[PDB]
Curated annotation (Swiss-Prot):
<feature type="binding site">
    <location>
        <position position="89"/>
    </location>
    <ligand>
        <name>S-adenosyl-L-methionine</name>
    </ligand>
</feature>
<comment type="subunit">
    <text>Interacts with importin alpha, leading to stimulate both RNA-binding and methyltransferase activity. Interaction with importin alpha and beta is required for its nuclear localization, importin beta dissociating in response to RanGTP, allowing RNMT-importin alpha to bind RNA substrates. Interacts with elongating form of polymerase II and RNGTT. Interacts with RAMAC, this interaction significantly enhances RNA-binding and cap methyltransferase activity.</text>
</comment>
<keyword id="KW-0489">Methyltransferase</keyword>
<keyword id="KW-0506">mRNA capping</keyword>
<dbReference type="GO" id="GO:0031533">
    <property type="term" value="C:mRNA capping enzyme complex"/>
</dbReference>
<keyword id="KW-0808">Transferase</keyword>
<feature type="site" description="mRNA cap binding">
    <location>
        <position position="193"/>
    </location>
</feature>
<feature type="site" description="mRNA cap binding">
    <location>
        <position position="256"/>
    </location>
</feature>
<feature type="binding site">
    <location>
        <position position="57"/>
    </location>
    <ligand>
        <name>S-adenosyl-L-methionine</name>
    </ligand>
</feature>
<feature type="binding site">
    <location>
        <position position="117"/>
    </location>
    <ligand>
        <name>S-adenosyl-L-methionine</name>
    </ligand>
</feature>
<feature type="domain" description="mRNA cap 0 methyltransferase">
    <location>
        <begin position="1"/>
        <end position="264"/>
    </location>
</feature>
<dbReference type="GO" id="GO:0043235">
    <property type="term" value="C:receptor complex"/>
</dbReference>
<feature type="binding site">
    <location>
        <position position="35"/>
    </location>
    <ligand>
        <name>S-adenosyl-L-methionine</name>
    </ligand>
</feature>
<feature type="binding site">
    <location>
        <position position="12"/>
    </location>
    <ligand>
        <name>S-adenosyl-L-methionine</name>
    </ligand>
</feature>
<dbReference type="GO" id="GO:1990830">
    <property type="term" value="P:cellular response to leukemia inhibitory factor"/>
</dbReference>
<comment type="function">
    <text>Catalytic subunit of the mRNA-capping methyltransferase RNMT:RAMAC complex that methylates the N7 position of the added guanosine to the 5'-cap structure of mRNAs. Binds RNA containing 5'-terminal GpppC.</text>
</comment>
<protein>
    <recommendedName>
        <fullName>mRNA cap guanine-N(7) methyltransferase</fullName>
        <ecNumber>2.1.1.56</ecNumber>
    </recommendedName>
</protein>
Length: 265
C-alpha cells in the first residue's frame, strides 16, 4: 500500500508544482481542492506558498479530518495559507452558492483522483466540471488525475471475464462490451467508479472556455518528469519501467492519466 500512495503523492507533487510555477509567471494564489479527502495535499500547497485554499469533499468525516490536519500544521513562525472547508456533493451542488464569497476566483482547481465519480450521469459530470471551472480566472488551471479509459478496456478485453488485476488491485466491470458515455460502472479495490472517456471530458470542458494544456498517461508523465533532476531527487527522497516500483505497482499505477486544462481569455 505505502509505495504506491507515495508514487501518487510524488505525481501530484510534480503536477501541482509545475502549475504553480506557470501561475506565478503572471504577477495572491487562491486554490480550489475539489474532492480534497483527508487533506493529503495540504502540505503540497503549503510548500507551494499559496495564500488561500478552499477544500471541499462529499464526505463530512474526511473534510473534518482535512480541517484538523490543517489546524495541526497551523498550530505547529512559517507562512501558511488561510483555508475554507465545505462539505458538498460537487456533482449535484453548486459551489458558487456555498463559498463565503460567491464571486471568488481561483488560480488553480486541483481535482486529484475524483472525476470518475461524477460520470454517473451527464448532469453530474457537467456539474462537477462547472464547479471546477466557472470560477477559474483567465489563464487559471484545472488539473487532475483519473483512470485512463483506454487502459481499463484494453485490460477488460484481454481478460477471460469482467475482471482483472494482480495482488495489489482489482478491477470489476458491471457489464462488459457496453461502454456508455455516462454510467459505465466498474469496481476498483471500495467504491463504484464510472468510466471517463477523455475525448468527452475534453469536449465537455469547452463549455466553460477551457482548452487542453496536456493529457499524459502516468507512464508518460513519469518518464518525461524524471528528466528534471529536481523531480527525480524528490522521488528519491519520498520513496514498463524497470525500477522505482515493482512490476505489480507499475501495473496498478499505469491505469491512470494526468490532465491539465486552461481558462481562456
Ligand atoms: N461528488 C463528489 N463531490 C466531492 N467529492 C467526492 C465526490 N465523489 C467522491 N468524492 C471524493 O473524492 C475523493 C476520491 C479520491 N480517491 C480522494 C483523493 C484525494 N484528493 C487525494 O488525492 O488524496 C474521496 O475523498 C471522495 O470522498
Amino acid at each position: 500500500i505505502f509505495y504506491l500512495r507515495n508514487f501518487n503523492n510524488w505525481m501530484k507533487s510534480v503536477l501541482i508544482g509545475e502549475f504553480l510555477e506557470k501561475v506565478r509567471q503572471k504577477k495572491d494564489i487562491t486554490v480550489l481542492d475539489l474532492g480534497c479527502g483527508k487533506g493529503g495535499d495540504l502540505l503540497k500547497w503549503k510548500k507551494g506558498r499559496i495564500n488561500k485554499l478552499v477544500c471541499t469533499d462529499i464526505a463530512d468525516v474526511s473534510v473534518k479530518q482535512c480541517q484538523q490536519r490543517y489546524e495541526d500544521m497551523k498550530n505547529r513562525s512559517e507562512y501558511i495559507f488561510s483555508a475554507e472547508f465545505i462539505t458538498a456533493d460537487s456533482s449535484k451542488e453548486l459551489l458558487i452558492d456555498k463559498f463565503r464569497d460567491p464571486q471568488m476566483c481561483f488560480d488553480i482547481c486541483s481535482c486529484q483522483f475524483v472525476c470518475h465519480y461524477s460520470f454517473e450521469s451527464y448532469e453530474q459530470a457537467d456539474m462537477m466540471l462547472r464547479n471546477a471551472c466557472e470560477r477559474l480566472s483567465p489563464g487559471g488551471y484545472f488539473i487532475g488525475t483519473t483512470p485512463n479509459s483506454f487502459e481499463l478496456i484494453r485490460r477488460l478485453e484481454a481478460s477471460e471475464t469482467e475482471s482483472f488485476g494482480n495482488e495489489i488491485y482489482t478491477v470489476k466491470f458491471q457489464k462488459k462490451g457496453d461502454y456508455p458515455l455516462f454510467g459505465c460502472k466498474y469496481d476498483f479495490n471500495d467504491v463504484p467508479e464510472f468510466l471517463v472517456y477523455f475525448p468527452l471530458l475534453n469536449e465537455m470542458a469547452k463549455k466553460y472556455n477551457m482548452k487542453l494544456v496536456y493529457k499524459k498517461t502516468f507512464l508518460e508523465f513519469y518518464e518525461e518528469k524524471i528528466k528534471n533532476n529536481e523531480n527525480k531527487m524528490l522521488l528519491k527522497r519520498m520513496q514498463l519501467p524497470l525500477g522505482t516500483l515493482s512490476k505489480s505497482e507499475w501495473e496498478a499505477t499505469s491505469i491512470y492519466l494526468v490532465f491539465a486544462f486552461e481558462k481562456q481569455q
